[PDB]
Amino acid sequence: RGSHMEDFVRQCFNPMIVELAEKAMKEYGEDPKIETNKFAAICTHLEVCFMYSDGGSKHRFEIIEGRDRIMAWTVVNSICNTTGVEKPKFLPDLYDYKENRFIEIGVTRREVHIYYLEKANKIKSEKTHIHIFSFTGEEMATKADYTLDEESRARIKTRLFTIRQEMASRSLWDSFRQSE
Ligand SMILES: O=C(NCCOc1ccccc1)c1nc([C@@H]2CCCN2C(=O)CCc2ccccc2Cl)[nH]c(=O)c1O
Ligand SMILES: [Mn+2]
Ligand SMILES: [Mn+2]
Protein backbone atom coordinates (compact mmCIF):
# COMPACT_ATOMS: atom_id res chain seq x y z
CA ARG A 1 0.00 0.00 0.00
CA GLY A 2 0.95 3.64 -0.48
CA SER A 3 3.26 3.55 -3.49
CA HIS A 4 4.33 6.69 -5.33
CA MET A 5 3.32 5.04 -8.62
CA GLU A 6 -0.28 4.60 -7.46
CA ASP A 7 -0.64 8.24 -6.43
CA PHE A 8 0.95 9.30 -9.73
CA VAL A 9 -1.55 7.24 -11.75
CA ARG A 10 -4.51 8.84 -9.99
CA GLN A 11 -3.07 12.31 -10.66
CA CYS A 12 -1.95 11.58 -14.25
CA PHE A 13 -5.06 9.91 -15.72
CA ASN A 14 -8.66 11.10 -15.61
CA PRO A 15 -11.07 9.58 -13.07
CA MET A 16 -13.18 7.58 -15.55
CA ILE A 17 -10.00 5.90 -16.82
CA VAL A 18 -8.72 5.10 -13.32
CA GLU A 19 -12.02 3.54 -12.25
CA LEU A 20 -12.35 1.43 -15.41
CA ALA A 21 -8.80 0.13 -14.91
CA GLU A 22 -9.53 -0.53 -11.22
CA LYS A 23 -12.66 -2.48 -12.17
CA ALA A 24 -10.64 -4.39 -14.77
CA MET A 25 -7.84 -5.38 -12.38
CA LYS A 26 -10.17 -6.41 -9.55
CA GLU A 27 -12.28 -8.39 -12.03
CA TYR A 28 -9.16 -10.42 -12.84
CA GLY A 29 -8.18 -10.65 -9.16
CA GLU A 30 -5.38 -8.07 -9.09
CA ASP A 31 -4.66 -5.18 -6.74
CA PRO A 32 -3.91 -1.68 -8.10
CA LYS A 33 -2.29 -0.84 -4.74
CA ILE A 34 0.47 -3.48 -5.11
CA GLU A 35 0.74 -4.29 -8.83
CA THR A 36 1.04 -0.58 -9.50
CA ASN A 37 3.09 -0.75 -12.72
CA LYS A 38 0.33 -2.81 -14.34
CA PHE A 39 -2.22 -0.34 -12.93
CA ALA A 40 -0.35 2.31 -14.91
CA ALA A 41 -0.23 0.04 -17.97
CA ILE A 42 -3.98 -0.54 -18.39
CA CYS A 43 -4.73 3.14 -17.73
CA THR A 44 -2.36 3.99 -20.59
CA HIS A 45 -3.90 1.28 -22.78
CA LEU A 46 -7.41 2.53 -21.97
CA GLU A 47 -6.61 6.17 -22.78
CA VAL A 48 -4.87 5.18 -26.02
CA CYS A 49 -7.87 3.05 -27.01
CA PHE A 50 -10.20 5.99 -26.34
CA MET A 51 -8.08 8.49 -28.28
CA TYR A 52 -7.94 5.98 -31.15
CA SER A 53 -11.73 5.71 -31.43
CA ASP A 54 -11.93 9.52 -31.24
CA GLY A 55 -9.90 9.71 -34.46
CA GLY A 56 -12.43 8.20 -36.86
CA SER A 57 -15.72 9.68 -38.01
CA LYS A 58 -18.85 9.65 -35.85
CA HIS A 59 -20.00 6.02 -36.20
CA ARG A 60 -16.72 4.41 -37.28
CA PHE A 61 -15.59 2.53 -34.17
CA GLU A 62 -17.32 0.22 -31.73
CA ILE A 63 -15.41 0.30 -28.44
CA ILE A 64 -14.88 -3.14 -26.88
CA GLU A 65 -12.13 -2.25 -24.41
CA GLY A 66 -13.31 -0.79 -21.12
CA ARG A 67 -16.42 -2.95 -20.92
CA ASP A 68 -16.92 -5.71 -18.40
CA ARG A 69 -15.95 -9.08 -19.85
CA ILE A 70 -19.50 -10.39 -20.33
CA MET A 71 -20.78 -7.26 -22.09
CA ALA A 72 -17.66 -6.99 -24.27
CA TRP A 73 -18.23 -10.49 -25.64
CA THR A 74 -21.94 -9.73 -26.07
CA VAL A 75 -21.16 -6.82 -28.40
CA VAL A 76 -18.58 -8.93 -30.26
CA ASN A 77 -21.21 -11.61 -30.87
CA SER A 78 -23.61 -9.00 -32.26
CA ILE A 79 -20.85 -7.51 -34.43
CA CYS A 80 -20.03 -10.95 -35.83
CA ASN A 81 -23.68 -11.93 -36.28
CA THR A 82 -24.32 -8.81 -38.41
CA THR A 83 -21.03 -8.51 -40.34
CA GLY A 84 -20.25 -12.19 -40.87
CA VAL A 85 -16.75 -11.63 -39.46
CA GLU A 86 -15.11 -14.56 -37.69
CA LYS A 87 -15.39 -14.56 -33.90
CA PRO A 88 -11.95 -13.58 -32.52
CA LYS A 89 -10.39 -15.98 -30.05
CA PHE A 90 -9.55 -13.22 -27.55
CA LEU A 91 -11.21 -9.92 -26.76
CA PRO A 92 -10.09 -7.16 -29.14
CA ASP A 93 -10.19 -3.47 -28.29
CA LEU A 94 -12.27 -1.91 -31.09
CA TYR A 95 -14.25 -2.77 -34.21
CA ASP A 96 -13.82 -0.74 -37.40
CA TYR A 97 -17.18 -0.31 -39.12
CA LYS A 98 -15.49 1.44 -42.04
CA GLU A 99 -12.99 -1.33 -42.84
CA ASN A 100 -14.89 -4.24 -41.21
CA ARG A 101 -12.17 -5.59 -38.93
CA PHE A 102 -11.46 -5.90 -35.23
CA ILE A 103 -8.48 -3.90 -33.95
CA GLU A 104 -6.08 -5.03 -31.22
CA ILE A 105 -4.17 -1.97 -30.00
CA GLY A 106 -0.83 -2.42 -28.26
CA VAL A 107 1.27 -0.14 -26.06
CA THR A 108 4.77 -1.45 -25.36
CA ARG A 109 7.95 -0.15 -23.73
CA ARG A 110 10.14 -2.44 -25.86
CA GLU A 111 10.87 -2.04 -29.57
CA VAL A 112 7.83 -2.36 -31.82
CA HIS A 113 9.05 -5.45 -33.70
CA ILE A 114 9.06 -7.81 -30.72
CA TYR A 115 5.62 -6.88 -29.35
CA TYR A 116 3.85 -7.14 -32.72
CA LEU A 117 5.25 -10.63 -33.33
CA GLU A 118 4.11 -11.87 -29.92
CA LYS A 119 0.76 -10.19 -30.58
CA ALA A 120 0.53 -11.92 -33.97
CA ASN A 121 1.64 -15.43 -32.98
CA LYS A 122 -0.55 -15.29 -29.86
CA ILE A 123 -3.46 -13.93 -31.91
CA LYS A 124 -3.41 -16.52 -34.71
CA SER A 125 -6.79 -14.99 -35.60
CA GLU A 126 -6.09 -14.30 -39.27
CA LYS A 127 -8.70 -11.57 -39.68
CA THR A 128 -8.11 -9.09 -36.84
CA HIS A 129 -6.02 -5.95 -37.37
CA ILE A 130 -3.09 -5.16 -35.09
CA HIS A 131 -1.75 -1.67 -34.25
CA ILE A 132 1.15 -1.02 -31.84
CA PHE A 133 2.34 2.23 -30.31
CA SER A 134 5.51 2.62 -28.25
CA PHE A 135 6.59 5.08 -25.58
CA THR A 136 9.32 6.37 -27.93
CA GLY A 137 7.05 7.25 -30.86
CA GLU A 138 7.25 4.23 -33.15
CA GLU A 139 4.23 2.43 -34.58
CA MET A 140 3.48 -0.57 -36.79
CA ALA A 141 0.20 -1.95 -38.10
CA THR A 142 -0.89 -4.97 -40.10
CA LYS A 143 -0.22 -4.63 -43.85
CA ALA A 144 1.19 -1.15 -43.09
CA ASP A 145 -2.43 0.08 -42.90
CA TYR A 146 -2.53 2.42 -39.90
CA THR A 147 -6.30 3.05 -40.26
CA LEU A 148 -6.35 6.58 -38.84
CA ASP A 149 -4.97 9.85 -40.19
CA GLU A 150 -1.45 11.03 -39.38
CA GLU A 151 -2.60 13.73 -36.95
CA SER A 152 -4.70 11.39 -34.80
CA ARG A 153 -1.92 8.84 -34.29
CA ALA A 154 0.61 11.65 -33.82
CA ARG A 155 -1.22 13.06 -30.80
CA ILE A 156 -1.38 9.53 -29.40
CA LYS A 157 2.42 9.35 -29.65
CA THR A 158 2.76 12.83 -28.11
CA ARG A 159 0.66 11.77 -25.11
CA LEU A 160 2.65 8.55 -24.65
CA PHE A 161 5.94 10.45 -24.50
CA THR A 162 4.50 13.00 -22.06
CA ILE A 163 3.53 10.10 -19.78
CA ARG A 164 7.11 8.82 -20.02
CA GLN A 165 8.61 12.17 -19.00
CA GLU A 166 6.33 12.68 -16.00
CA MET A 167 7.26 9.17 -14.87
CA ALA A 168 10.97 9.83 -15.38
CA SER A 169 10.80 13.17 -13.56
CA ARG A 170 9.50 11.22 -10.53
CA SER A 171 12.14 8.45 -10.85
CA LEU A 172 9.35 5.98 -11.67
CA TRP A 173 10.22 5.32 -15.33
CA ASP A 174 13.09 2.91 -14.64
CA SER A 175 10.82 0.67 -12.57
CA PHE A 176 8.03 0.79 -15.16
CA ARG A 177 10.23 -0.03 -18.15
CA GLN A 178 11.60 -3.15 -16.42
CA SER A 179 8.12 -4.32 -15.40
CA GLU A 180 7.25 -5.36 -18.97
O1 LIG B 1 -7.08 -7.01 -23.36
C2 LIG B 1 -6.08 -7.40 -22.76
N3 LIG B 1 -6.10 -8.25 -21.74
C4 LIG B 1 -7.34 -8.75 -21.16
C5 LIG B 1 -7.56 -8.27 -19.75
O6 LIG B 1 -6.45 -8.71 -18.95
C7 LIG B 1 -6.30 -8.19 -17.70
C8 LIG B 1 -5.25 -8.61 -16.90
C9 LIG B 1 -5.09 -8.08 -15.64
C10 LIG B 1 -5.97 -7.13 -15.17
C11 LIG B 1 -7.01 -6.70 -15.96
C12 LIG B 1 -7.18 -7.23 -17.23
C13 LIG B 1 -4.71 -6.91 -23.17
N14 LIG B 1 -3.65 -7.46 -22.56
C15 LIG B 1 -2.43 -7.04 -22.89
C16 LIG B 1 -1.24 -7.67 -22.18
C17 LIG B 1 -0.37 -8.56 -23.08
C18 LIG B 1 -1.13 -9.87 -23.04
C19 LIG B 1 -1.42 -10.02 -21.57
N20 LIG B 1 -1.60 -8.63 -21.12
C21 LIG B 1 -2.03 -8.31 -19.88
O22 LIG B 1 -1.82 -9.09 -18.96
C23 LIG B 1 -2.74 -7.01 -19.64
C24 LIG B 1 -1.86 -5.91 -19.05
C25 LIG B 1 -1.47 -4.84 -20.05
C26 LIG B 1 -0.14 -4.62 -20.41
C27 LIG B 1 0.21 -3.64 -21.31
C28 LIG B 1 -0.76 -2.85 -21.88
C29 LIG B 1 -2.07 -3.03 -21.55
C30 LIG B 1 -2.42 -4.02 -20.64
CL31 LIG B 1 -4.12 -4.20 -20.26
N32 LIG B 1 -2.25 -6.08 -23.84
C33 LIG B 1 -3.32 -5.50 -24.49
O34 LIG B 1 -3.13 -4.63 -25.35
C35 LIG B 1 -4.59 -5.95 -24.13
O36 LIG B 1 -5.62 -5.39 -24.76
MN1 LIG C 1 -8.13 -5.41 -24.51
MN1 LIG D 1 -5.02 -4.12 -26.73
The per-residue DSSP string of 32-99 comes to TTTSHHHHHHHHHHHHHHHHHHTTS-TTSEEE-TTS-HHHHHHHHHHHHHHH-----SS--SEEETTT
Half-sphere exposure of 47 (CA within 13 A, CB side): 21
CB-ligand 1 contact for 42 (6 Å cutoff)? yes
d(CA 99, CA 36): 36
Cα of 42 vs centre of ligand 1, distance in Å, is: 7
d(CA 87, CA 108): 26
Element (H, E) at 104: strand 101-108
How was this model experimentally determined?
Answer: X-ray
d(CA 71, CA 139): 30
**8 A C-beta contact, residue 115 and residue 132:** yes
Please report, for the chain, the start and end positions of each structural domain, with discontinuous segments joined by +: 1-180
Domain formed by 1-180, architecture: 3-Layer(aba) Sandwich (3.40)
In 3D, which of 55, 97, 105, 60 has the Cα closest to residue 78? 97
**What is the three-class DSSP state of 128?**
coil
Resolution (Å) of this entry: 2.2
Residue nearest to atom 30 of ligand 1 (CA): 42
Phi first, then psi: what are they for 128, rounded to 5°? -65, 155
- Environment class of 91 (CB within 10 Å of its CB; exposed 0-12, middle 13-18, buried 19+): middle
Half-sphere exposure of 77 (CA within 13 A, CB side): 6
**8 A C-beta contact, residue 159 and residue 55:** no
**8 A C-beta contact, residue 9 and residue 18:** yes
**8 A C-beta contact, residue 103 and residue 147:** yes
